[PDB]
Amino acid sequence: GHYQAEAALLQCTADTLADAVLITTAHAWQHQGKTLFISRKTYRIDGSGQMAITVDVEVASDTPHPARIGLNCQLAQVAERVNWLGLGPQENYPDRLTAACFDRWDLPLSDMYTPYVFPSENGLRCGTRELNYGPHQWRGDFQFNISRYSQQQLMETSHRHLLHAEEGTWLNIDGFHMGIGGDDSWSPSVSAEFQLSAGRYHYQLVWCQK
Amino acid sequence: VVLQRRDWENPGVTQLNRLAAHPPFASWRNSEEARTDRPSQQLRSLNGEWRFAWFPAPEAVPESWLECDLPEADTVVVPSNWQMHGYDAPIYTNVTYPITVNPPFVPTENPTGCYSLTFNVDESWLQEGQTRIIFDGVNSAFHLWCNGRWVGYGQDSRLPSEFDLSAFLRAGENRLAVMVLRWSDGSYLEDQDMWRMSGIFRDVSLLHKPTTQISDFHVATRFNDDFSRAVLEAEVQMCGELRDYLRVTVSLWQGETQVASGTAPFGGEIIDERGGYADRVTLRLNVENPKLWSAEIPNLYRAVVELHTADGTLIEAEACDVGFREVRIENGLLLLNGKPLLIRGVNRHEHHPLHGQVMDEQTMVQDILLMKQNNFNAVRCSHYPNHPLWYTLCDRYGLYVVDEANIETHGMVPMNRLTDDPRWLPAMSERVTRMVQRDRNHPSVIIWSLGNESGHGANHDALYRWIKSVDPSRPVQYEGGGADTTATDIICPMYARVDEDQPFPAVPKWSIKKWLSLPGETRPLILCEYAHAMGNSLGGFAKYWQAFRQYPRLQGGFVWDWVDQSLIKYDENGNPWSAYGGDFGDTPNDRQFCMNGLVFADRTPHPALTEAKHQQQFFQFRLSGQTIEVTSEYLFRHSDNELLHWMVALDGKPLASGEVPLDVAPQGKQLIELPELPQPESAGQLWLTVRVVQPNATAWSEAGHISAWQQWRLAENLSVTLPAASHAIPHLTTSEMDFCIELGNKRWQFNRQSGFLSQMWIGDKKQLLTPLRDQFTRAPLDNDIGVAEATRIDPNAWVERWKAAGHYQAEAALLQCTADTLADAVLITTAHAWQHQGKTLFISRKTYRIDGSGQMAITVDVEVASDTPHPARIGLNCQLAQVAERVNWLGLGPQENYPDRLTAACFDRWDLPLSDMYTPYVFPSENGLRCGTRELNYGPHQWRGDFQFNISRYSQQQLMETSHRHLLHAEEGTWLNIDGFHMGIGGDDSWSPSVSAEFQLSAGRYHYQLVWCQK
Ligand SMILES: CC(C)S[C@@H]1O[C@H](CO)[C@H](O)[C@H](O)[C@H]1O
Ligand SMILES: [Mg+2]
Ligand SMILES: [Mg+2]
Ligand code: NA
Ligand code: NA
């Protein structure tokens, strides 16, 4: 039920600190009475206008290891360039990132999408410490992809020529992403060390305007 | 003559007047006594009280000593090492010879043990036949006199030296004088890594043989292809007068049942142009469906060899245990009885903390039972032939033995300097040939070894071929000169790693997986030494066993080693303590390197022994749905003394359990389907534990013995229910110097200058003696330390890297300390930098959240500079004010376990006395860690999270600063170390870094969270 699991809110609080506002949230994803994941977050917005997002995820040990532990949203902005400090410039995944180099990369948005004839998850860049898109900046240690196509649309389209640019830009920022495998393509081929099996995951992001 | 000839400085003289070597003799004059292996009237022990005087050199020994007792002599027990009686110092050196390397010469100051015995001989022994004396082991060389008359001389410390005393003895009282030299030319071939001791350290005996006698016998067993048929072949040689009426009968018995018998007169088949052996005969006995010998089922027959006359008068009988087994290498695999072995082996030195190198039956039995109880099936005699009883015990209890010649020349430069030299071939040959002649009839002996750490020389090639020629029944191995030379049937490296190459010049240690498939290589690979168990070690032991099971030609190895070579010393209070190298004034020495055991010298297990047991299990398990698949790794036996216990528990709370009989054929499978388990009440992780239990007692185990176990995570129910909101609210009291939190009778004190929680109160009582601070270091384990390189200690060693980077000196700089009041909690936020000479090593960022329920949630985020050596641990430490009797935890246990040594540990609720949370390694270090811990309880405290911890009355600082465990003193309160992350311990070897990459703390950023609360 990973594709059908609905978020259930367990907690949502706001606190005022000496120099910041703190939002604390907790969610559970369930399918047929079974809790798959729990997500606990704090958002800390300070006087510099930077939102520090802290995320702790619990994954039920008996659920199939998830494909990613991350956040997504559709941004209103469509900018021409994507600029990042991390592994690049080409698409790279946790078990396919040896060729990528850590540096400052700057590409047109279209280059952040790989036009696989059969549409799928694509365009990820790993080991990224800073992402810049339009007025936004994200900082941390994450994996991301950025395109005009939702995961939902990539999931529902059989050929690439049938894809349509959606309004704005879909951003996927992952603390963790599962390997892609490929030893063969007719059985599970992602090696144990590239499966998301730790049970407890932690990542932190900073969202700001620069 | 004796002082003039200096036979102890001449490698061409290894003995004088010594009798030929042979299998164990008892010279029974009764066949039934021979059959039942009862005592023989013709084999007397001379062990007991002897007279002894120590001298600094053989020149200092008075001539009068030959004729009568020296008044200044003491009465001492023999067998003994004279170092153990305090006459001089035992010396611990590993590689470097304890004497100047100047072969064949030894120091002029050469400790000399003067032994003597006044003993009686029956007149009947002298009126007929031959009376010989047998010295099972004398270290290192000796001259022998009897009644003032010189008899002979002997070398090789580890094989019996026999002399004919018939012409020397008188009826009634006689006196032996034995002059034992500590050093001889023999010493150059005896450079094993062990205490250097000396004396008559094995049994002394008198054997009476008739004049017409069995002088040798060899027993071989050959089989057809399916082992349903065997021929036992016995070659028997006589000495004395040949007469036509002489006969030899060889009978074979299975218990009380005679299986076969054959009689012939003397006279062997034509051998060459000159005829055959008139003084030999070979008997061949047919055996249908023989019960085969193995370590799994040590089936033994008894062979009795009778020398007799035609009319039926017995002259004498000799005898041995026969094991019907075939050892062969075929298609690159070592086979026993047609089946590929998997050697679960250990190296074992003959060591006793009190008696030094003297062995006794009780100790030997204790060792074997402990070995078998821990899933060992094999032992290597490192690095010499053993006390003769060892092989009898291995025959009967079932262990595969590698018999090893007493030749080690480790300290030569280069290592093969003597073994490549034809002048040393004679001395070397005797150590090999006389071992084979003694031990060739033991079924437990399955492999011959040419010695240890003596490079590869042409003398090895000669002696390798000599063995293949005289005994085709057993493979020959030898590790020297690169582990895969022409002198070995088996690739037998020491401390070759699983996946990592160590490409040393000339003698590389390839990864074992890679070694097998090197171009042209076909041989089986069995490590003669691996998993160096020095102190807190056996990290990565699981990695060897995964490879052993996966690769057919990786057929296992021998752990280094069985037992810590510590010795007992006594202080002023007369209290015994465990001593290592240097502790006797011995210098140069190699300190604690004599202690590499899976057990302490008194045979108490180290925690690593349980990891060995688990990894060497003879049953493999898989879980699919509700089905458990049990695979037998036994080659010969069915599981006819086994049942499976299973148990399902929710975070330690038993929910369901049961037992199933195991009926698995060798190498076979059994499917066991678990019944539908009741639905669990609450949130938590269900855990399945299986154990294989032996209901019946055996020769080597007691009823209820657990031989195998495995665990799996079953279903997990994540807690979604919010905790009931506590009405109480904590108050923040701000000072210039302190942030203080109060909740009823509870106070938390945060020092605003240091940035740490400096104190906690429950009413009047202080909780802490030292503040709660980050810790990134550990008291170094032996594996962290390594060895001295030369001009300095090896800079590659972990401890050296940590010291150089300033890890042990790093001082916390406070970057931020702030307090905040929340809706229902107080939040303390801190940041620290650890710096050394301007360099920031670690940054720790923390939040402490204290809520109305009285719980403190600590969140720790650590940055580790990528260019600092990877830290030993990421955690917290403090000294608790309280000392409590019990320690209770939900996590991996019950024994000490580390990230690369935790497979043996089980997840459950464990409760131990506090003293059991400390491992008393003779050389103190970080110890007693337990991993995968979700909850820890100690007195009034409870910690929850996902952490590793140790808890003891010793600080890391004290452990780090103390050379010996007996010098440790319990500090006030209790030191607690709670780690989010702990580096592996390694141990593939203990003289270079050996922690695998996946167990190094190299991620750069680390997160962990704890909840501290009262219980
Ligand atoms: C220290 C190494 C260079 S030699 C190393 O020493 C060990 C110490 O227990 C063992 O004696 C090994 O057999 C030997 O190879
Ligand atoms: Mg000599
Ligand atoms: Mg050595
Ligand atoms: Na698709
Ligand atoms: Na194997």
Ligand code: NA
């Ligand atoms: Na050693």
Ligand code: NA
């Ligand atoms: Na059974």
Ligand code: NA
């Ligand atoms: Na120490």
